[PDB]
Design a binder for this molecule. Structure first.
Ligand SMILES: *[C@@H]1O[C@H](CO)[C@@H](O)[C@H](O)[C@H]1NC(C)=O
Length: 407
């Protein structure tokens, strides 16, 4: 009797944390699909959940004309003639309509318009991205869809022409202008303990069903609980699992960053990039490669900050999809997909469309009596499930004096 499985409301709550199920693609680098454009096969971001706080850190020279900001416009041919190597600018789609209307960034007020069906601001930007496709050379609508960033502060929706997310090595690219002959600067995905929390990155496919992310993706940190897996008749938090990575942290936010940046996070990036005959890297989109990985969202995406009995702040990282929780008011559970904050921001609350509940961890002492599992005689602990201040509690406690003879 895992209560988190036996209770269908608690079960459906825990499902939001399964990134392999809903997101289904890379998170650190998302390149989960393939689409041909003008006779060439390109990798395309495909994941269904927004990645909160994800930004691409660029490594352009530290001088004019370089902004080191992936939200800047992709450069014009002239701009690049003027700058020298490497390319200046950013990843932002710079196209104009025949009318001369700019496509990105696009303001949320203009979206909130009946061609846009999403009920939340973040969903409206995802839906905009989903309704925006590469046009081929000739000029026809293609199936390749650009990823987006919602800058939730400025309320602006960015369609990124550049769908590349990681490029490293003097093979392909320069770091702060060294070596100088290379066309591309290097870049990589980051989250920061302090910056760009108000930026949300996503594949266009978050917009295909633009309200689904609200209730199927783990958007927000989970305060007051530690991710766990049901074993031996009780909830074992990640600290009790053999394959967990445990690192010391100074702060809870560093743990949140580590769930995205650790070496085992779900990533669709190949270890060597494609064999071309170009001098170096020379495309706006990643090329299809026979041996490309598709993580399908599987990876060390999960973790929690907690304080050990020694008083040290630590971060437990796991690839194990959680199917239970251990309650701990000081703990916070994070994923590679969600935000640092545990509070639901305004811009994923229907602007109109009732808010979907998560009432699954609410309880009453009356209807939810103290319940004890059987003693795990290996650890000599047993599950205790109960209700305190209207919140479900789940911990491992001492076995009865009698059961201890069997440990
Ligand atoms: C997570 O989702 C994937 C794909 O649907 C599934 O294979 C896996 O069992 C799920 N894990 C759970 C519920 O622990």
């Amino acid at each position: 009797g895992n209560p988190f499985q036996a209770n269908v409301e608690m079960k459906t709550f825990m499902e939001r944390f399964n990134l392999t199920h809903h997101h289904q693609s890379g998170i650190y680098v998302d390149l989960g699909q393939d689409k041909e454009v003008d006779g060439t096969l390109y990798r395309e971001p495909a994941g269904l959940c927004p990645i909160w706080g994800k930004h691409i850190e660029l490594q352009q020279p530290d001088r004019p004309p370089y902004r080191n900001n992936f939200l800047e416009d992709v450069p014009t041919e002239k701009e690049y003639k003027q700058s020298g190597n490497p390319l200046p600018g950013g990843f932002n789609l710079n196209f104009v309509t025949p009318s001369g209307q700019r496509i990105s960034p696009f303001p949320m007020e203009l979206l909130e318009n009946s061609n846009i069906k999403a009920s939340t601001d973040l969903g409206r930007c995802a839906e905009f991205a989903f309704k925006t496709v590469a046009m081929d050379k000739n000029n026809k609508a293609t199936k390749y869809r650009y990823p987006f960033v919602y800058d939730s502060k400025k309320r602006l929706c960015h369609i990124l022409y550049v769908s590349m997310q990681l490029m490293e090595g003097k093979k392909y690219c320069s770091v702060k202008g060294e070596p100088p002959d290379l066309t591309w600067y290097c870049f990589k995905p980051r989250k920061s303990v302090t910056e760009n929390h108000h930026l949300i990155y996503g594949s266009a496919y978050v917009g295909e069903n633009p309200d689904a992310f609200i209730s199927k993706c783990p958007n927000q940190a989970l305060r007051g609980y530690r991710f766990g897996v049901w074993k031996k008749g009780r909830c074992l938090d990640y600290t009790e699992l053999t394959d967990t990575v445990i690192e010391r942290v100074e702060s809870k936010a560093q743990c949140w960053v580590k769930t995205f940046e650790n070496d085992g996070v779900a990533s669709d990036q190949p270890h060597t990039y494609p064999l071309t005959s170009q001098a170096s890297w020379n495309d706006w989109w990643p090329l299809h490669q026979s041996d490309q990985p598709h993580s399908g969202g599987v990876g060390r995406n999960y973790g929690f900050y907690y304080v050990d009995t020694t008083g040290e702040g630590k971060c437990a990282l796991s690839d194990q999809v959680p199917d239970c929780l251990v309650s701990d008011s000081a703990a916070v559970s994070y994923t590679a997909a969600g935000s640092l904050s545990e509070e639901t921001p305004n811009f994923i609350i229907p602007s109109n469309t009732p808010p979907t509940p998560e009432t699954a961890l609410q309880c009453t002492a009356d209807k939810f009596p103290d319940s004890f599992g059987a003693c795990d005689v290996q650890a000599c602990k047993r599950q205790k499930t109960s209700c305190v201040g209207g919140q479900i509690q789940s911990t491992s406690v001492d076995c009865t004096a009698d059961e201890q003879n069997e440990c």
